[PDB]
Amino acid sequence: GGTRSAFSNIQAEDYDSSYGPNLQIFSLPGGGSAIGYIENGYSTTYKNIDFGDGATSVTARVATQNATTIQVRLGSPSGTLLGTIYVGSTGSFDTYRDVSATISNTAGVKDIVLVFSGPVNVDWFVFSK
Ligand SMILES: O[C@@H]1[C@@H](O)[C@H](O[C@@H]2CO[C@@H](O[C@@H]3CO[C@@H](O)[C@H](O)[C@H]3O)[C@H](O)[C@H]2O)OC[C@H]1O
Ligand SMILES: [Ca+2]
Secondary structure, three states: OOOEEOOOOEEOOOOOEEEOOOOEEEEOOOOOEEEEOOOOOOEEEEEEEEOOOOEEEEEEEEEEOOOEEEEEEEOOOOOOEEEEEEEOOOOEEEEEEEEEEEEEEEOOEEEEEEEEOOOOEEEEEEEEO
16 A cells, blocks of 8 residues: 555645646635646646556546646656546636546556646546546
8 A cells, every 4th residue: 555546536736746837735715725826838746546447537626717738647747648638717716616537547556647738726636437
């Protein structure tokens, strides 16, 4: 063990490494934190996520004023592209909605990377079989 499950919420602020000089962790009104001040080409890595025996869907709780994408990659921002979440505008960086995307079947313990194409605030993400 010593391993977050893919099937419970992974807090987006709980990255192990990241690229993006302007990236902030900040607190949410209802409790907890989220990541934000994201720009194109920023990424975060979440070490040792246990995808167990298969996940084929990702859900992210996100907020943004303009449609944007989050790529879900293996290992590094240059790794295998498992899928892309096409994030709709929610009207506000404070209005959060759960958004889902399919991914290639992913199993076992993996390092997961989210790669951003523009501004978005992210509370958590989770996978489903
Ligand atoms: O309540 C706070 C949120 O509103 C805050 O959202 C940030 C708002 O600023 C965003 O940056 C703008 C994106 O578009 C660019 O063209 C502008 O130059 C930027 O300033 C940023 O992406 C959001 O995260 O987040 C923190 C909350 O406390
Ligand atoms: Ca969070």
